[PDB]
mmCIF file of C-alpha atoms in Angstrom:
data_model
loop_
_atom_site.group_PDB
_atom_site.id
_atom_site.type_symbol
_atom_site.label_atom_id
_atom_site.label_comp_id
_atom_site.label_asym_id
_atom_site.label_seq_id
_atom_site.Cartn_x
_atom_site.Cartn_y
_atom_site.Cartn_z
ATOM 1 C CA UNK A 1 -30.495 0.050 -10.367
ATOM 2 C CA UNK A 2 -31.281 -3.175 -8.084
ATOM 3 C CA UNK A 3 -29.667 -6.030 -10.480
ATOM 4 C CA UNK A 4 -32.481 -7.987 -9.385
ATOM 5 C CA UNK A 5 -34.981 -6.073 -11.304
ATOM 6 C CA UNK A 6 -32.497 -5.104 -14.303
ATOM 7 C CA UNK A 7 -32.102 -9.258 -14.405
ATOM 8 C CA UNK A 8 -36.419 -9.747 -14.623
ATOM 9 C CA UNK A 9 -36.080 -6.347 -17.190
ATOM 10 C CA UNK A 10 -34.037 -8.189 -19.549
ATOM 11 C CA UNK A 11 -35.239 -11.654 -19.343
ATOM 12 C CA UNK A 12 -38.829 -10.455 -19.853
ATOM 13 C CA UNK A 13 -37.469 -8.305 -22.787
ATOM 14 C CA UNK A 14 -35.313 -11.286 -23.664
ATOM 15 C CA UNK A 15 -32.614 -8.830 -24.344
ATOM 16 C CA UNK A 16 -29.432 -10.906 -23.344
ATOM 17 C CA UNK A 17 -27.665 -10.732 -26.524
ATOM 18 C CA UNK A 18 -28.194 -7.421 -26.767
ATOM 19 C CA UNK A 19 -26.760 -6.520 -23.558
ATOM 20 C CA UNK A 20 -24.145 -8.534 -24.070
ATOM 21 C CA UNK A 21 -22.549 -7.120 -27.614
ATOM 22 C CA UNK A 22 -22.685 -4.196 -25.756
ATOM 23 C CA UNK A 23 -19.877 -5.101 -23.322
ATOM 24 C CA UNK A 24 -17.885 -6.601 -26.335
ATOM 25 C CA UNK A 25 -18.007 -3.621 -28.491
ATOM 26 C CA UNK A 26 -17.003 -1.722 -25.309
ATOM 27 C CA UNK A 27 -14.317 -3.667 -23.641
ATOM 28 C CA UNK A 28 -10.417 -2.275 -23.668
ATOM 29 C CA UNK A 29 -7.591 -3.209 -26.257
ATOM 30 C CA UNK A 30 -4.582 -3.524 -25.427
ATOM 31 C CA UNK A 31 -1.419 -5.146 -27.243
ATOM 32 C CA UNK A 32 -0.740 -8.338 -27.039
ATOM 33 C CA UNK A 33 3.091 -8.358 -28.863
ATOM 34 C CA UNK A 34 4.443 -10.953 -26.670
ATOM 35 C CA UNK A 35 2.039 -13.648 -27.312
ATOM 36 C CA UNK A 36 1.870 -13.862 -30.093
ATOM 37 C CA UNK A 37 6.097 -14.384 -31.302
ATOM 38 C CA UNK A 38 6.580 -17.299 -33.352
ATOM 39 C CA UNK A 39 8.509 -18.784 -30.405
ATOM 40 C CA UNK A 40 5.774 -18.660 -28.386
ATOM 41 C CA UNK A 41 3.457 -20.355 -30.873
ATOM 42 C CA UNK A 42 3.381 -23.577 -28.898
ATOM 43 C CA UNK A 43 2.632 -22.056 -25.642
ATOM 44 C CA UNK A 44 -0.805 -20.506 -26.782
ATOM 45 C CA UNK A 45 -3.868 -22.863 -26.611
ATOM 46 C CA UNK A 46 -6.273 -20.923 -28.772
ATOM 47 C CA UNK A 47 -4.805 -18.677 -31.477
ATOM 48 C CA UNK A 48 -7.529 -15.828 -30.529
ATOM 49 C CA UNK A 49 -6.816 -15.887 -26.311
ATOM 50 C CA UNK A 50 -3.964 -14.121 -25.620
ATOM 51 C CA UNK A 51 -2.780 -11.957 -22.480
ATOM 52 C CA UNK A 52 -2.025 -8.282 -23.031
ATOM 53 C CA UNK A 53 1.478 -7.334 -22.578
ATOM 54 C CA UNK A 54 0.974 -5.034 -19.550
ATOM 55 C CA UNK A 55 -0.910 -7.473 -17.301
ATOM 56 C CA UNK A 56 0.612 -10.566 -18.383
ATOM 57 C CA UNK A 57 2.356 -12.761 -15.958
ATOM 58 C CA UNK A 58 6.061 -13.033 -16.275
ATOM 59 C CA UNK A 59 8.008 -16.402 -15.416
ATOM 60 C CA UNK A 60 11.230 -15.869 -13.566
ATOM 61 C CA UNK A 61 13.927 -16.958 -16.330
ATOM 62 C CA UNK A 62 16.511 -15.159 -18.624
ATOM 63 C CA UNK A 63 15.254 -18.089 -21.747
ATOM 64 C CA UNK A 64 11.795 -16.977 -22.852
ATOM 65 C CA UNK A 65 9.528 -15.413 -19.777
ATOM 66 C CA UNK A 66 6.132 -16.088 -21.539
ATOM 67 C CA UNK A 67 3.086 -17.602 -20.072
ATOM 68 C CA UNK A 68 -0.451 -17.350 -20.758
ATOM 69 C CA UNK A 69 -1.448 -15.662 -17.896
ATOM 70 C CA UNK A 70 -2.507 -12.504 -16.470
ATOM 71 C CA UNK A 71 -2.435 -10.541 -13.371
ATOM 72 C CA UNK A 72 -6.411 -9.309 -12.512
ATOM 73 C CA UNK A 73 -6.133 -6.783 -9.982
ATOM 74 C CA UNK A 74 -9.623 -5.003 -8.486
ATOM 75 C CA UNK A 75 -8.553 -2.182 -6.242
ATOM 76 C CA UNK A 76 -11.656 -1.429 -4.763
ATOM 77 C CA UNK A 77 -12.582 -4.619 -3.839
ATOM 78 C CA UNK A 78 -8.943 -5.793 -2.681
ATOM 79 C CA UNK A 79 -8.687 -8.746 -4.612
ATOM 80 C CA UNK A 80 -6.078 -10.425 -7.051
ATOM 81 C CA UNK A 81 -6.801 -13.104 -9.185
ATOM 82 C CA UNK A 82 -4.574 -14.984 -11.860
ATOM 83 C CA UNK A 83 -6.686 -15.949 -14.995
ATOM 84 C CA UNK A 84 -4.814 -18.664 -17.332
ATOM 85 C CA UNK A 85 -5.750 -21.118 -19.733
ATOM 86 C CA UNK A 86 -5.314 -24.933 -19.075
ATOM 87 C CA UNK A 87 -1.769 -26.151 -19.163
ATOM 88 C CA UNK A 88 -0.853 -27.640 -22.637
ATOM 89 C CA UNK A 89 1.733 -31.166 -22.738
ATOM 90 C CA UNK A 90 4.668 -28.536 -23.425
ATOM 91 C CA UNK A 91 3.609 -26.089 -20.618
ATOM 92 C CA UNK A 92 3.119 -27.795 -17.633
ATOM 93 C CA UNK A 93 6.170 -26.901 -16.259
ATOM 94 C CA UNK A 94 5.543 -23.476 -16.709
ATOM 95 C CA UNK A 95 2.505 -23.824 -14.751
ATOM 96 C CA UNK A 96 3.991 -24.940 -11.551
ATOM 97 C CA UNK A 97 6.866 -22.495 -11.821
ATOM 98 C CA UNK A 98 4.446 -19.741 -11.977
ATOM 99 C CA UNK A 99 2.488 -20.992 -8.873
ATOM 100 C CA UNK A 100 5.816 -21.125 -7.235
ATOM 101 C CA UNK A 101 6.985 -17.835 -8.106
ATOM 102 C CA UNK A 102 3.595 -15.933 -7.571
ATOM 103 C CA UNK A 103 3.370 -17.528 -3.658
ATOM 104 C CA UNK A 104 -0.327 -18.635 -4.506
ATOM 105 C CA UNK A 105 -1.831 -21.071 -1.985
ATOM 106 C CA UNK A 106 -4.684 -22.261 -4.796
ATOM 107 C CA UNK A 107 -5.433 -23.465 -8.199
ATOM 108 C CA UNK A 108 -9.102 -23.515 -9.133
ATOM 109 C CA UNK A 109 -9.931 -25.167 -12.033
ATOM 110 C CA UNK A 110 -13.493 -25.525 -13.696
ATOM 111 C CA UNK A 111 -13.124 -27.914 -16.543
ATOM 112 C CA UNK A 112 -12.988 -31.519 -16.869
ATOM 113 C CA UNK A 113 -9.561 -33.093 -18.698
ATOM 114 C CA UNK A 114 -11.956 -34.387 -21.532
ATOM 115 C CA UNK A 115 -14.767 -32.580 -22.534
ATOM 116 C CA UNK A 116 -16.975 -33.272 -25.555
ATOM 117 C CA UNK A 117 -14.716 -36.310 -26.094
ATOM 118 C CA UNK A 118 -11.784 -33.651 -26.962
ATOM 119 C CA UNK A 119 -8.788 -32.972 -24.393
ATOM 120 C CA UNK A 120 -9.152 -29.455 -22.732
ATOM 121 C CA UNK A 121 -6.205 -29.573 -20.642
ATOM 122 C CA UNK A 122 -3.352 -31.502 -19.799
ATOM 123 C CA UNK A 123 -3.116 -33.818 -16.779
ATOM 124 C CA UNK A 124 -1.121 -31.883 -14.833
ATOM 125 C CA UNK A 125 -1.320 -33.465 -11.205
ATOM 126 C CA UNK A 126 -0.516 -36.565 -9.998
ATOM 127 C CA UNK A 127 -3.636 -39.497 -9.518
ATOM 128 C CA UNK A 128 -1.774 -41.750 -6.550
ATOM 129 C CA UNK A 129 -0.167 -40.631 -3.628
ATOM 130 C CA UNK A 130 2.856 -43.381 -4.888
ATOM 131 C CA UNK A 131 3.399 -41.630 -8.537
ATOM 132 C CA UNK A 132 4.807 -38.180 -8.113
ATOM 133 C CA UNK A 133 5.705 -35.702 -11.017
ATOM 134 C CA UNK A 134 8.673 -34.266 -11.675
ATOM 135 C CA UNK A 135 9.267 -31.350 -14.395
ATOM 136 C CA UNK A 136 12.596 -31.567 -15.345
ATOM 137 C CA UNK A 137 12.523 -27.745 -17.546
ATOM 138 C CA UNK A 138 11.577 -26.102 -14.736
ATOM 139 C CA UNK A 139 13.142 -28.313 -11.655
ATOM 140 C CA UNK A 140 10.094 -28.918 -9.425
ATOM 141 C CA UNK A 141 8.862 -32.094 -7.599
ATOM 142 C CA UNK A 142 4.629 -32.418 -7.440
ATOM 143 C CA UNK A 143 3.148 -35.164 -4.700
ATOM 144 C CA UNK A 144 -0.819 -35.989 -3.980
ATOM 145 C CA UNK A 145 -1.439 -36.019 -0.601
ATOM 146 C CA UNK A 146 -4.680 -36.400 -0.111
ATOM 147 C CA UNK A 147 -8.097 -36.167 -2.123
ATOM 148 C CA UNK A 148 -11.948 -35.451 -1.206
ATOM 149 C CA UNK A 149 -14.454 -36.215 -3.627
ATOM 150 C CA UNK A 150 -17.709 -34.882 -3.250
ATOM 151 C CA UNK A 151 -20.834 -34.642 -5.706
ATOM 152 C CA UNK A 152 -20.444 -31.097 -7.340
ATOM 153 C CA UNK A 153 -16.444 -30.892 -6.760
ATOM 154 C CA UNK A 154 -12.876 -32.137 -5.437
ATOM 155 C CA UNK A 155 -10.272 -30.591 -3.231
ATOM 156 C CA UNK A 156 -7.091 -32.255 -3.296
ATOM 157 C CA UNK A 157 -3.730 -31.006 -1.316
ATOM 158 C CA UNK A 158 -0.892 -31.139 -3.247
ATOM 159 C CA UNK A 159 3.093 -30.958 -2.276
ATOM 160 C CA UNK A 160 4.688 -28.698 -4.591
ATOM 161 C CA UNK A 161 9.270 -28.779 -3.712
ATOM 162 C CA UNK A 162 11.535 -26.624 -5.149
ATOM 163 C CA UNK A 163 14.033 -29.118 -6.608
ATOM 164 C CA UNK A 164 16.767 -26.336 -6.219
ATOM 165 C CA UNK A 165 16.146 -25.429 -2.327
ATOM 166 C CA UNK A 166 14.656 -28.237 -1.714
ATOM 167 C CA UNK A 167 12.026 -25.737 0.105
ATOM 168 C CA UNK A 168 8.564 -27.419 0.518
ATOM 169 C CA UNK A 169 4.958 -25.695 0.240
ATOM 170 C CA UNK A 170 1.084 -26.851 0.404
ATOM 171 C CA UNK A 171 -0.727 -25.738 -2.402
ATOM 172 C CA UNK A 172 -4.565 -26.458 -2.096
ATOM 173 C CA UNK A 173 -5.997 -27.624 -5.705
ATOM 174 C CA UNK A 174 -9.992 -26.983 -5.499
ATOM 175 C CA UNK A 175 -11.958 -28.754 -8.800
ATOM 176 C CA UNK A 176 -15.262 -27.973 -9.708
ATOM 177 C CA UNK A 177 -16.393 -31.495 -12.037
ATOM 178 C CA UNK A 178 -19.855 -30.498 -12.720
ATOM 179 C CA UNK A 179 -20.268 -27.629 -15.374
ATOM 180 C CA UNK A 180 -21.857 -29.252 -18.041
ATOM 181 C CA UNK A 181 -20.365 -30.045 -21.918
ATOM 182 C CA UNK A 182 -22.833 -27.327 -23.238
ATOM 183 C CA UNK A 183 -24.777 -24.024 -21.749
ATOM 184 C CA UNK A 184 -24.198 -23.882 -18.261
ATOM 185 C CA UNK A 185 -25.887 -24.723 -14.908
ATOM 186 C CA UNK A 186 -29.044 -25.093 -14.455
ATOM 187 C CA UNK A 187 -29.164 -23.664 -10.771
ATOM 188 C CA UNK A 188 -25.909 -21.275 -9.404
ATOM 189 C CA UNK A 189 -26.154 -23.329 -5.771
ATOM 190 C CA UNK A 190 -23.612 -25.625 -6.204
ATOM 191 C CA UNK A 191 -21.225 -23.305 -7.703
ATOM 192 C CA UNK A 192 -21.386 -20.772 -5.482
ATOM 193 C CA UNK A 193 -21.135 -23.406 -2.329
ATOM 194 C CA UNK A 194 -18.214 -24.564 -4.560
ATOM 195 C CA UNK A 195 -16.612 -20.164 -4.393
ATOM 196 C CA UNK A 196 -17.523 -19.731 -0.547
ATOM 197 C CA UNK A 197 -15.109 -23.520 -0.087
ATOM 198 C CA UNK A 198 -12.538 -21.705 -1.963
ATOM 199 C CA UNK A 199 -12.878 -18.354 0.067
ATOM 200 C CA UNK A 200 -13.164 -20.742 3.842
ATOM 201 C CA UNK A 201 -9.672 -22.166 2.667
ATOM 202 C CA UNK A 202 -7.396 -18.427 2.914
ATOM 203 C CA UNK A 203 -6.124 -19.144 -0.799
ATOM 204 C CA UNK A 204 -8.086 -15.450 -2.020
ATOM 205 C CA UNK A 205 -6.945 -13.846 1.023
ATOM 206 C CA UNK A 206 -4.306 -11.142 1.782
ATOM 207 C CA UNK A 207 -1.327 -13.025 3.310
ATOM 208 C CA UNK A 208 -1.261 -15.495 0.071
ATOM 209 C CA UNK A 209 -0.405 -14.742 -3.544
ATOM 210 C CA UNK A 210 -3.133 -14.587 -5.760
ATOM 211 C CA UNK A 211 -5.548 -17.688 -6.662
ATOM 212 C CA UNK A 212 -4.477 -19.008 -9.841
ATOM 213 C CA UNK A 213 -7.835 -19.933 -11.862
ATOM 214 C CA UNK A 214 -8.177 -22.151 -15.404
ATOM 215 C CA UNK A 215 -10.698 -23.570 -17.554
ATOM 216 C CA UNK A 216 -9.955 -24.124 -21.029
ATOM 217 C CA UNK A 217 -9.340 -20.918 -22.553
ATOM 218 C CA UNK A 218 -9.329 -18.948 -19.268
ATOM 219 C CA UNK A 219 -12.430 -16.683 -19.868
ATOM 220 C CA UNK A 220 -15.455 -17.756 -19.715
ATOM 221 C CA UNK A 221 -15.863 -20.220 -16.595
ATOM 222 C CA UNK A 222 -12.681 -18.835 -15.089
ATOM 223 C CA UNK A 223 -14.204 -14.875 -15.726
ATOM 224 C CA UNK A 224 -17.522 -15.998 -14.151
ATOM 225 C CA UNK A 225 -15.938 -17.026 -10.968
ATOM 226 C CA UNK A 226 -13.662 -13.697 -9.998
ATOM 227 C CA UNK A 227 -16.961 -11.594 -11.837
ATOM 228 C CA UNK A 228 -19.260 -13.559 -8.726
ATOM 229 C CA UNK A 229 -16.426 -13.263 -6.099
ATOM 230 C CA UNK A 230 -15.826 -9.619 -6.332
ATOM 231 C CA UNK A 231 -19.439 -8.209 -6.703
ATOM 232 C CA UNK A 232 -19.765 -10.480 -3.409
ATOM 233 C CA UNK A 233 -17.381 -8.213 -1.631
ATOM 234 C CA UNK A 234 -18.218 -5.191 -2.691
ATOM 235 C CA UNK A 235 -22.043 -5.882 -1.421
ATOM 236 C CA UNK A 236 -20.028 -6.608 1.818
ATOM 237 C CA UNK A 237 -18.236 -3.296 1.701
ATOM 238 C CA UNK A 238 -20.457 -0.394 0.443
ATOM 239 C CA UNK A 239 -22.614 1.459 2.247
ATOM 240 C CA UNK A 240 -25.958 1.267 -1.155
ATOM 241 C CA UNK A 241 -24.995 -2.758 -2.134
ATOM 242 C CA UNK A 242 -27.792 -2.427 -5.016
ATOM 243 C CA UNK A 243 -24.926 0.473 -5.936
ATOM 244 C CA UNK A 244 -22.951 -2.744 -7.506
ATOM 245 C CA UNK A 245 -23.188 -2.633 -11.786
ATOM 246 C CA UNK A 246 -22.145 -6.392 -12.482
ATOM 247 C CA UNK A 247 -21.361 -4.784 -16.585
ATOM 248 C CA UNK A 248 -19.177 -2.196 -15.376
ATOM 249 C CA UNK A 249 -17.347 -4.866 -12.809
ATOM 250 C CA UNK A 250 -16.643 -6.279 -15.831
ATOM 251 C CA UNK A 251 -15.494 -4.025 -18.033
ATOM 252 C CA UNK A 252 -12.972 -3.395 -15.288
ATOM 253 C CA UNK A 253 -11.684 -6.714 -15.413
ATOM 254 C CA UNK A 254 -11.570 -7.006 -19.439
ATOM 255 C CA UNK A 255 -8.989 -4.115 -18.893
ATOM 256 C CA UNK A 256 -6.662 -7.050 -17.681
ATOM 257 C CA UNK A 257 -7.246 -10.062 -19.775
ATOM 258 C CA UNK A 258 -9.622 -10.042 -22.817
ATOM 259 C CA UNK A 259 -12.919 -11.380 -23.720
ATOM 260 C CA UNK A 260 -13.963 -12.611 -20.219
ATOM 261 C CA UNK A 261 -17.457 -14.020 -20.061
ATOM 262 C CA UNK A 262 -17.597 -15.747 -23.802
ATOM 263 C CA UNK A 263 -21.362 -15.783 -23.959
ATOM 264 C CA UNK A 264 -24.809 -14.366 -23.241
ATOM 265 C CA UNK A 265 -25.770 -17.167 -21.625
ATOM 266 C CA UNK A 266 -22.502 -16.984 -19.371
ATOM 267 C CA UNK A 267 -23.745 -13.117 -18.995
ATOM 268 C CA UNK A 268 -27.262 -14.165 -17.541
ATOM 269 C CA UNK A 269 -25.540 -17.114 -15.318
ATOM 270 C CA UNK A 270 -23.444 -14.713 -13.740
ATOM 271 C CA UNK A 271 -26.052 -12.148 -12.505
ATOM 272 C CA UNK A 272 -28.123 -14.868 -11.501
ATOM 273 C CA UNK A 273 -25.207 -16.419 -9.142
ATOM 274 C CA UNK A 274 -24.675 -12.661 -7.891
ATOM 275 C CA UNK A 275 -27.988 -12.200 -7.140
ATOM 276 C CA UNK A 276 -28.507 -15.940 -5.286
ATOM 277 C CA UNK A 277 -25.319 -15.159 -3.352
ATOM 278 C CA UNK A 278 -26.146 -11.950 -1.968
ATOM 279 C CA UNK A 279 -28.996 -13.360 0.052
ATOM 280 C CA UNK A 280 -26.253 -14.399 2.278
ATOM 281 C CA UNK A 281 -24.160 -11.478 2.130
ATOM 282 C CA UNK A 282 -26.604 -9.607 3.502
ATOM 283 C CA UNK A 283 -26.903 -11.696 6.699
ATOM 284 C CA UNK A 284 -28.813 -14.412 5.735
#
């Protein structure tokens, strides 16, 4: 069925929360052991968002490997993501290591520092070109080399050096500053200009490791944006594009990380941003 007229279907029918219980009470379960060790307690954000064990993204050390993070892999589609939540004060290190070790060339992140007057994330990159980080745990240098700021988002390229090797990389940071505090956007233009920057850049392509995306929690902004971006492709690459089911996209990718897309108004934003987008996709 055209998603276009399943979208007019349920809003007429105002059916939304409906629809979207029925993806909850559908979606996988798989263990998640490792997250939740008491050693790992301080590494966990939100005490209900945890990666399962089989997708979850391993850090390269003999200490304690854990990371919330997981591996998002759509075969059909040929696309990787990494979904994570926002780096906490005692995780940023981790962070970078894992950017390192995966070879990603991006980090897309959706959420503001403060939010709601609350802190949703650490500050995690450096502000002046002069002040560079270093994290000592994980022996990595981080430098800001330059910074465009633009009404709907920022793209910033960053210096990440292996401390160890002293082997250098560019790692492209791309920050969307305009999702509001509560709902979400009124229009999907400026966040799917924001996904087609991200795409002209390489960092989702082939010859790169995967992106590595955050919000808060990593699943609700963050599952929006890989949900858009790979029902995008696969109107590219099938022969019947209105063949593309948007709810059973996503029940693929809750196989890898749970409870992606956190609310029916998320749902409704989504299918509206797929639906927007593919008016260029199909050579427009």
């Amino acid at each position: 069925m055209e998603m276009e007229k399943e979208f007019e279907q349920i809003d007429k029918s105002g059916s939304w929360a409906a629809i979207y219980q029925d993806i909850r009470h559908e979606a996988s379960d798989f263990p998640s052991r490792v997250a939740k060790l008491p050693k790992n307690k301080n590494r966990n954000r939100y005490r209900d968002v945890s990666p399962f064990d089989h997708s979850r993204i391993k850090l390269h050390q003999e200490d304690n490997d854990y990371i919330n993070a997981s591996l998002i892999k759509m075969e059909e589609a040929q696309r990787s993501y990494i979904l994570t939540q926002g780096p906490l004060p005692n995780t940023v290190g981790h962070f970078w290591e894992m950017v390192w070790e995966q070879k990603s060339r991006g980090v897309v992140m959706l959420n503001r520092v403060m939010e709601k007057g609350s802190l949703k994330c650490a500050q995690y990159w450096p502000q002046k070109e002069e002040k560079e980080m270093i994290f000592e745990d994980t022996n990595l240098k981080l430098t800001l080399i330059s910074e465009d700021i633009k009404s709907y988002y920022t793209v910033r390229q960053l210096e990440l050096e292996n401390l160890t090797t002293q082997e250098t990389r560019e790692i492209l940071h791309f920050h969307y500053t305009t999702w509001p505090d509560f709902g979400v956007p009124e229009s999907p233009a400026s966040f799917l200009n924001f996904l087609f920057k991200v795409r002209e850049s390489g960092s989702l392509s082939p010859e790169h490791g995967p992106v590595v995306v955050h919000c808060s929690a990593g699943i609700g902004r963050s599952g929006t944006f890989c949900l858009a971006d790979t029902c995008l492709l696969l109107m590219d690459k099938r022969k019947d594009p209105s063949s593309v089911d948007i709810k059973k996209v996503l029940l693929e990718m809750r196989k890898f990380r749970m409870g992606l897309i956190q609310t029916a108004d998320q749902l409704r934003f989504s299918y509206l941003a797929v639906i927007e987008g593919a008016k260029f996709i199909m050579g427009d």
